[PDB]
Amino acid sequence: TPNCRVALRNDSYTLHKILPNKVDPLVSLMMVEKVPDSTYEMIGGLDKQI
Amino acid sequence: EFLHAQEEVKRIQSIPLVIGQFLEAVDQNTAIVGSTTGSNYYVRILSTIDRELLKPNASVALHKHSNALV
Amino acid sequence: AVQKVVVHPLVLLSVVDHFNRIGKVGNQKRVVGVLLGSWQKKVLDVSNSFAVPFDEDDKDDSVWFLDHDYLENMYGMFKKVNARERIVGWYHTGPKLHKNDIAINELMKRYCPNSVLVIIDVKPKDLGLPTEAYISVEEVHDDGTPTSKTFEHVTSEIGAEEAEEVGVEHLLRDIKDTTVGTLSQRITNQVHGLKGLNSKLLDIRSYLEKVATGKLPINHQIIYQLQDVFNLLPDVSLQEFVKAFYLKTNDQMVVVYLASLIRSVVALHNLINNKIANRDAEKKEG
Amino acid sequence: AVDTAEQVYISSLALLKMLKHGRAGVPMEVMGLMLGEFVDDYTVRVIDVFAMPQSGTGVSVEAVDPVFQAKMLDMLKQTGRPEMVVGWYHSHPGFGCWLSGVDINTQQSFEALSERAVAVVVDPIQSVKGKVVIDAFRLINANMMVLGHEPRQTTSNLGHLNKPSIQALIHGLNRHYYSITINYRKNELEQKMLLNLHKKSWMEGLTLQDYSEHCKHNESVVKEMLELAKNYNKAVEEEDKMTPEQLAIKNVGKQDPKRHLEEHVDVLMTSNIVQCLAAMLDTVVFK
Numbered sequence A: 001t002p003n004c005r006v007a008l009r010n011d012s013y014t015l016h017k018i019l020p021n022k023v024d025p026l027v028s029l030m031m032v033e034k035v036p037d038s039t040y041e042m043i044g045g046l047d048k049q050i
Numbered sequence B: 001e002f003l004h005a006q007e008e009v010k011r012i013q014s015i016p017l018v019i020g021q022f023l024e025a026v027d028q029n030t031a032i033v034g035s036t037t038g039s040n041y042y043v044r045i046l047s048t049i050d051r052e053l054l055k056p057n058a059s060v061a062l063h064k065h066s067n068a069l070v
Numbered sequence C: 001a002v003q004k005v006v007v008h009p010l011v012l013l014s015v016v017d018h019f020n021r022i023g024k025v026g027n028q029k030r031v032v033g034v035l036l037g038s039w040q041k042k043v044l045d046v047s048n049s050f051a052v053p054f055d056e057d058d059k060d061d062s063v064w065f066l067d068h069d070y071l072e073n074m075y076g077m078f079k080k081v082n083a084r085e086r087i088v089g090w091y092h093t094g095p096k097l098h099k100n101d102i103a104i105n106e107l108m109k110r111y112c113p114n115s116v117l118v119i120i121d122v123k124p125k126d127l128g129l130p131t132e133a134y135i136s137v138e139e140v141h142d143d144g145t146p147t148s149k150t151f152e153h154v155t156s157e158i159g160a161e162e163a164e165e166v167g168v169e170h171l172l173r174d175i176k177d178t179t180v181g182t183l184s185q186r187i188t189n190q191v192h193g194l195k196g197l198n199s200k201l202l203d204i205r206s207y208l209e210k211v212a213t214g215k216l217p218i219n220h221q222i223i224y225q226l227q228d229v230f231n232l233l234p235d236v237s238l239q240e241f242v243k244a245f246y247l248k249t250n251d252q253m254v255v256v257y258l259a260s261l262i263r264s265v266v267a268l269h270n271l272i273n274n275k276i277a278n279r280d281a282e283k284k285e286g
Numbered sequence D: 001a002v003d004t005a006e007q008v009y010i011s012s013l014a015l016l017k018m019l020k021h022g023r024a025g026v027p028m029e030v031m032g033l034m035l036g037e038f039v040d041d042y043t044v045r046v047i048d049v050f051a052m053p054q055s056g057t058g059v060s061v062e063a064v065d066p067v068f069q070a071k072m073l074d075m076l077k078q079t080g081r082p083e084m085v086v087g088w089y090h091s092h093p094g095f096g097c098w099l100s101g102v103d104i105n106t107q108q109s110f111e112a113l114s115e116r117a118v119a120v121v122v123d124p125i126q127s128v129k130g131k132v133v134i135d136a137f138r139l140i141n142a143n144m145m146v147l148g149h150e151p152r153q154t155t156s157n158l159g160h161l162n163k164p165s166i167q168a169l170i171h172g173l174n175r176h177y178y179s180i181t182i183n184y185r186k187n188e189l190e191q192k193m194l195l196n197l198h199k200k201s202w203m204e205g206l207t208l209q210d211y212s213e214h215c216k217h218n219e220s221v222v223k224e225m226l227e228l229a230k231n232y233n234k235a236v237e238e239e240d241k242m243t244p245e246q247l248a249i250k251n252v253g254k255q256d257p258k259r260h261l262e263e264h265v266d267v268l269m270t271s272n273i274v275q276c277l278a279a280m281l282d283t284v285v286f287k
């Protein structure tokens, strides 16, 4: 696979397992994982821009 | 023997731990962590830690030799 | 001035095998060897030892043989392989100790000034006795008394460092007297903690039997030093009375309503969780 | 006339000399000898171990001092017991156990002089918790290249004691040397004197730790046990059909309903009974 990491046995260097989840360092605030902060109706007066 | 098991699980963590940072979680009880020695690793993790503290990122404690999450 | 000695468990251990080395020709019933040490503070430390040829005669009990030349060279070996360690004294066994120990000690105080000796007990190993250690001082005896030697005692203990508990914990593997105890473990500590109470007391029983009956000459020091013990035990009173039920009840309340009730309700929760899951698999078999 | 699945007996007094002397010189790969008796064909015992003075070379044939050899042997003849040397050992701190290239040459020297001359490798800094990384080995010939190396035979205790570990078979296992099993010449009167003398307390068995911290600790548990009881209220009055075998498994957390429950009830029970029972006995015994 592209950018595929594998689990490598540290003695003899044999492929232990295909590792999933290709490299994503510092993606923390990316994909926020909690949305509900304000709703669609509580804006008011900006209908054309919406 | 059940009390021998809980003791030996308990005294694997009171040690001079090294500190790396949690990187990614594959599945149940195994994950990717990168040390602050460099040289990113892939080790087993415990059954003690509630898994909701490993969000993408946390400084974590690691054994020297077995290198597992502690 | 010695606070206490620290017995590393290789030394006793290395006495018992050497008693077993001569045991195939065993007719001596005592083993004398050299006790290496590491003097740090008023507390003493022992971590190594070896043995030396020694003999003793029952007749006249004053013809005895420490070997100086064997003590010179083999200590020169252990100094060469480890310059941390030096001599601190010597050991023997056979708890009814021979009175020759004045002569053994006063010889090898020219190797260590504050020399010290430890008695191990290879065969008596049952009730309450790990080891015993003495210290050598010499007063005259007392104010208006003749001269004497009078070995004095310093308390002892068995020590523990890392990479010998590793050797200990790998060698027990059977019952181990497991970590922090249960109800049964604490009660046995009260049992054989009390089985030695009368055991020390049956010894002090027999002493003032055989000294007050009229056999051996009385010490005076031990008599009044025993006297204040009897005028120090507490008695029962009203102040002991109302206080004891003030805090026995306070210990009791924690047991009664907080431990017995809540453990019952948890087991009562396991009733309904079982009986629901029992019959709902029963009525839904077919 | 060839090797089997043998057995190595080490004494209890040997093992403490091993990993104390290894822990003493933890950076610098300490060295010592191994003194026992070849008792038959395929068992061996060792009773005694003495160390060696350390040279600038390290673990090799040159660190074996022949004048320290015969003088140390001489003064063990008249005191204790004289016996034959049966091998040697050294310490490998940074890794578990395998014979190095300098380790394999000094093994050739002793196996040419002696019968088999079993080596021992001890890692002191890995052997910490409750297990010891000690292993013993023996050099195998190249003449049996057309035959079965490790010439083992009629027994079923080869698959025990270790499978050949991956960190050790990457080195000369199993085509330069073979492993050999270790159990302990363990006996009574040494077992009980090490049990009863390292962990014992006589007059401590009826002490009190009296009440200023004991009854204080009776507050120290009940308070969060109150709040944890309110958390126990929460899950039980919840009781919804959210597929309750799935609802119980998706919230395992070493948490409230039974795990963080009566465990505290046990500790409150054991502390107070042993306190109050020892209190009533001291009134009984002392007048």
Ligand SMILES: [Zn+2]
Pocket: D059, D090, D092, D099, D100, D102, D103
């Ligand atoms: Zn080596």
